[PDB]
Design a protein around this nucleic acid. Structure first.
Ligand SMILES: [Cl-]
Ligand SMILES: [Cl-]
Ligand SMILES: [Cl-]
Ligand SMILES: [Mg+2]
Ligand SMILES: [Mg+2]
Ligand SMILES: [Mg+2]
Ligand SMILES: [Mg+2]
Ligand SMILES: [Mg+2]
Ligand SMILES: [Mg+2]
Ligand SMILES: [Mg+2]
Ligand SMILES: [Mg+2]
Ligand SMILES: [Mg+2]
Ligand SMILES: [Mg+2]
Ligand SMILES: [Mg+2]
Ligand SMILES: [Mg+2]
Ligand SMILES: [Mg+2]
Ligand SMILES: [Mg+2]
Ligand SMILES: [Mg+2]
Ligand SMILES: [Mg+2]
Ligand SMILES: [Mg+2]
Ligand SMILES: [Mg+2]
Ligand SMILES: [Mg+2]
Ligand SMILES: [Mg+2]
Ligand SMILES: [Mg+2]
Ligand SMILES: [Mg+2]
Ligand SMILES: [Mg+2]
Lengths: 136, 386, 61
RNA sequence: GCAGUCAAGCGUUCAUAGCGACAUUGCUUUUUGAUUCUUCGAUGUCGGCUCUUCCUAUCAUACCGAAGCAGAAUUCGGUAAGCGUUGGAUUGUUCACCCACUAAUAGGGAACGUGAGCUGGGUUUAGACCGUCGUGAGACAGGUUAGUUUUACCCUACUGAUGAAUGUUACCGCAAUAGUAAUUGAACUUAGUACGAGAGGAACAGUUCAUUCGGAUAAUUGGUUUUUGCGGCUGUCUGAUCAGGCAUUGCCGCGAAGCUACCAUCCGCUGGAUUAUGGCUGAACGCCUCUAAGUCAGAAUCCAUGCUAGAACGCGGUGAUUUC
RNA sequence: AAGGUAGCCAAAUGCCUCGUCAUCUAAUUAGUGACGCGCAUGAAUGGAUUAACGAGAUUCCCACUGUCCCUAUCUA
RNA sequence: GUGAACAGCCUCUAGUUGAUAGAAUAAUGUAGAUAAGGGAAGUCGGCAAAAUAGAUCCGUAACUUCGGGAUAAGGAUUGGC
């Protein structure tokens, strides 16, 4: 998550290793996000860094506005297709993988989010919650 | 030359050798330190693992996100019928270690205990303890002398107890006998307590209570001969590998010109002695109590046994202990429950647990009904009942 | 404790059982087991599956 | 390659906080040479992959000393190898060079560890092309493309598994010795506080989680299907129907049990003695001094507690011990 | 004896060399397009260009996947 | 018989029923297979495997020696009665 996070997050099953491409759910002009790193990841030989709901990643825009391409920017995952278990015993998952472009502090580059947003991500990042319409 | 990249070692070297346990009943190698300013009590108990189920409770932990919120947890149920005290043993301190000095047995022993002393019970004359019982035929002078010797010399007192295997759905018929150390009181008080409990039963609720941390000692599930990949968790070799890929590629350098003890090798997996600590008790159940699986919220009348019974075990008809999490060993295996060796105050202990719901759906499939009455209410009347 | 209802079959869902599916339009679906979820993913219609609650209501069984 | 000695000078003043010319004394065998002792009736040859252990000249983590150390950050040094030291683009590469995460991305050894462990991209047989050289056959530590990687059943080592003989047999125990394990980060709070003109900006205790690792476990979720359990479908065969055979498990959907996944859940203890260092009392030396006698506190260190095995030539307690 | 013309190139031919610029990527000793005092390109020792074809040698993209993250299970 | 078919698959005539056997179902193999989320991050290199596939209808670029490229690419449909 890096700096700017409010509180901590219970562990969520990882489903987005490095190299995954997820949809862009904001209106910044990007159409997909290509994850190159995960903030706060550990070290293990041969193990790919992987991200889950609410994590902050480093991504590059592959499709979208020309000014957003060919550069590295932080992003926050807001939807996850890999199923995970909540502490109330519920296993759940989304239809797609989605993220939003942000800054190192967590402030959103855009101003609107399309589609549902996971509850864990909204609580961790106050800026995402403000721009989200429906949580879960 | 040095290895190209650094990685931590595979496996724990303190759990060596990975051989089969000497007996199916795992040994208790450490008892709690005795405090002799307390009443005499047992320090462990014997039970049989029946199975696992699920509970719902409200979390009481300030600062947690799920504070004052329901959580779903897995628990393990241990069938714990009362044990029978049938003897006592005294130990003397020695420069070479603790040594057993005297053993005194009860006057009468049931067929459950006597089967433990035989390998061919059906053919034997059943002569065990026949001459020893004659020591009670007189006024007990022989028994009094041995008990006096324990009081005079012993520094550690343990009691011999056996399970009531006939009360379980198991087909063994042969009870398990074990020593349990007595903590609290003087040596004379320990011996008097043991003597008065000959041929008596001790219930589990006199040993353990609600919201108490206990340790589980048992022999793990066996799996036979196992390769290195699953036995130690080594990386699988590439698909191109000739001569097989579920192996360790290099088992040692040229020098020393020997295979070292710290290299992963294929061999026995499972059936090892294990001691796992800090397992909180969620419920101490009573066998004669109807509505064993009922809470103050559910209010329905149902036992702890799931619909169709515990898979491969049967029904629970005696006292039981419900413990949070998982326990070493498989179903139908004798387990030993031990009190904590230290006082835990991590705020995960000492917290009061209040169960709100206990799952009693069938574990033989995707069970969807808690009770037979609920099933009747949903499906209605079937062709068989009309 | 709260008991939910299977979206495909109408079966009761106790805590911990089944999965929860959030569709793209932010519609929430509950399934008691993997069979109903698999039939939902195959786009089967519950009114033509004989053992479902909706089928029994439609045919007045 | 690494480390000392001396101190002209650098450092606003100020040799030695941190550096240090001219000279000089060493250490190391992770460079390359020098040599030709061993091997040409053959010790398989580059790199990577995999796995274990060792060294400390310590990158990070623990505890400290010093500063041109206000705070924050950094720099020099000590005890310390207990514990970690990564994911990728290009290259056959060792090396190198960038991107990124991270507490950190420290340097090395083990026949330049490791080919009856793999792989065969490179080098280094025979085919072929190019450039330069040669009259030519051909040469090139120049470039390019294609080119068979054999054997363990023996001994030992290692991992597990039995077992004669200690009157017989059975049950309950003791513990010599050997092994041993946990690890690191973030957020909240302390606190916009101490400190500082300001800009900036901590720490101890407390709480909630997470990283790496380890040991188990299968209630739940996911995976697996010869349950060939139920249903469906194609071709053909048994006259039709019913019910079946064959298609090397015919195919598809669901699918209990078992096994199993940081793709699931649970658990991973606390006492003593010390190192560096900071002190007490106190001489030598009428004073002064942590040291000489004595003595206090003290590190991820050590030994125990705890955990695993149980000497098959270590040991104790207890039951029953045969008449054709 | 004449001194490399037309073309072409760090090309299977360039030592220096991972040449310089541009493009491709988050990052390229790779690829491509240019540049040429070219160690040592060059005209039937054939130069340059070419549709179609190739179990030939290379680079990138889409689809695809147990190659991999990270292993698990079943049959003979 | 199915089908475009001397393809694969099943059957009639005819011919064989031969290849050391019994028991058990550890590791490692050989052969055949399936996988949540990600999708070449693996590797010298997509090696291996997967995906595509018949027929009818629609639609088809640069370039070209005008013959091709071409099944380019990209879509739709398919049973029974
Ligand atoms: Cl270890
Ligand atoms: Cl020549
Ligand atoms: Cl196998
Ligand atoms: Mg044992
Ligand atoms: Mg091979
Ligand atoms: Mg079950
Ligand atoms: Mg020889
Ligand atoms: Mg050799
Ligand atoms: Mg040889
Ligand atoms: Mg070597
Ligand atoms: Mg070889
Ligand atoms: Mg070798
Ligand atoms: Mg060899
Ligand atoms: Mg080669
Ligand atoms: Mg050759
Ligand atoms: Mg495991
Ligand atoms: Mg022994
Ligand atoms: Mg040139
Ligand atoms: Mg070029
Ligand atoms: Mg000419
Ligand atoms: Mg036809
Ligand atoms: Mg898959
Ligand atoms: Mg999938
Ligand atoms: Mg790659
Ligand atoms: Mg790689
Ligand atoms: Mg291929």
């Amino acid at each position: 998550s890096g700096n700017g996070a409010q509180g901590t997050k219970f562990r969520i099953s990882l489903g987005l290793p490095v190299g995954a491409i997820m949809n862009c759910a904001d209106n910044s002009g990007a159409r997909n996000l290509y994850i190159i790193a995960v903030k706060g990841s550990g070290s293990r030989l041969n193990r790919l860094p992987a991200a889950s709901l609410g994590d902050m990643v480093m991504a590059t825009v592959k499709k979208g506005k020309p000014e957003l391409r060919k550069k590295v920017m932080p992003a926050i995952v807001v939807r996850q297709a890999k199923s995970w278990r909540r502490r109330d015993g519920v296993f759940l998952y989304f239809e797609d993988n989605a993220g939003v472009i942000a800054n190192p502090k967590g402030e959103m580059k855009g101003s609107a989010i399309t589609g549902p947003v996971g509850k864990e991500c909204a609580d961790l990042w106050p800026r995402v919650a403000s721009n989200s319409g429906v949580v879960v | 030359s040095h290895r190209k990249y650094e990685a931590p070692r595979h496996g724990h070297l303190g759990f060596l050798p990975r051989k089969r346990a000497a007996s199916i009943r795992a040994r208790v190698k450490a008892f709690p330190k005795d405090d002799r300013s307390k009443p005499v009590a047992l320090t462990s108990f014997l039970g049989y693992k029946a199975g696992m189920t699920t509970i719902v409770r409200d979390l009481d932990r300030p600062g947690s996100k799920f504070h004052k919120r329901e959580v779903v947890e897995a628990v393990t149920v241990v069938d714990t019928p009362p044990v029978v005290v049938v003897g006592v043993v005294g130990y003397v301190e020695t420069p070479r270690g603790l040594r057993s000095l005297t053993t005194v047995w009860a006057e009468h022993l049931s067929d459950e205990v006597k089967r433990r002393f035989y390998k061919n019970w059906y053919k034997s004359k059943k002569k065990a303890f026949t001459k020893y019982s004659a020591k009670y035929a007189q006024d007990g002078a022989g028994i009094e002398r041995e008990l006096a010797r324990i009081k005079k010399y012993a520094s550690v007192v343990r009691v011999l107890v056996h399970t009531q295997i006939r009360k379980t759905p198991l087909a063994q018929k042969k009870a398990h006998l074990a020593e349990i150390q007595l903590n609290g009181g003087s040596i004379s008080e320990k011996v008097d307590w043991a003597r008065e409990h000959f041929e008596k039963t001790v219930a589990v609720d006199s040993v353990f209570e609600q919201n108490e941390m206990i340790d589980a000692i048992a022999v793990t599930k066996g799996h036979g001969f196992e390769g290195v990949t699953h036995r130690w968790g080594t990386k699988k070799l590439p698909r191109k590998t000739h001569r097989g890929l579920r192996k360790v590629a290099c088992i040692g350098a040229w020098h020393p010109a020997h295979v070292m003890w710290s290299v992963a090798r294929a061999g026995q997996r499972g059936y090892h002695s294990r001691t796992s600590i800090n397992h909180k008790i969620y419920r101490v159940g009573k066998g004669d109590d109807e509505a064993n699986g009922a809470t103050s919220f559910d209010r329905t009348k149902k036992t702890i046994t799931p619909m169709g019974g515990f898979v491969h075990y049967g029904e629970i008809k005696n006292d039981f202990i419900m413990v949070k999490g998982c326990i070493p060993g498989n179903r139908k295996r004798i387990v030993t429950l031990r009190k904590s060796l230290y006082t835990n105050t991590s705020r995960k202990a000492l917290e009061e647990v209040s169960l709100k719901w206990i799952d009693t759906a069938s574990k033989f499939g995707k069970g969807r009904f808690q009770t037979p009455a609920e099933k009747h209410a949903f499906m209605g009347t079937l062709k068989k009942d009309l | 404790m709260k008991v939910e209802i299977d979206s495909f079959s109408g079966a009761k869902i106790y805590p911990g059982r089944g999965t929860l599916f959030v569709r793209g339009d932010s519609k929430i679906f509950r399934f008691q087991n993997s069979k109903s979820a698999s039939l939902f993913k195959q786009r089967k219609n519950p009114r033509r599956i004989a053992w479902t609650v909706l089928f029994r209501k439609h045919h007045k069984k």
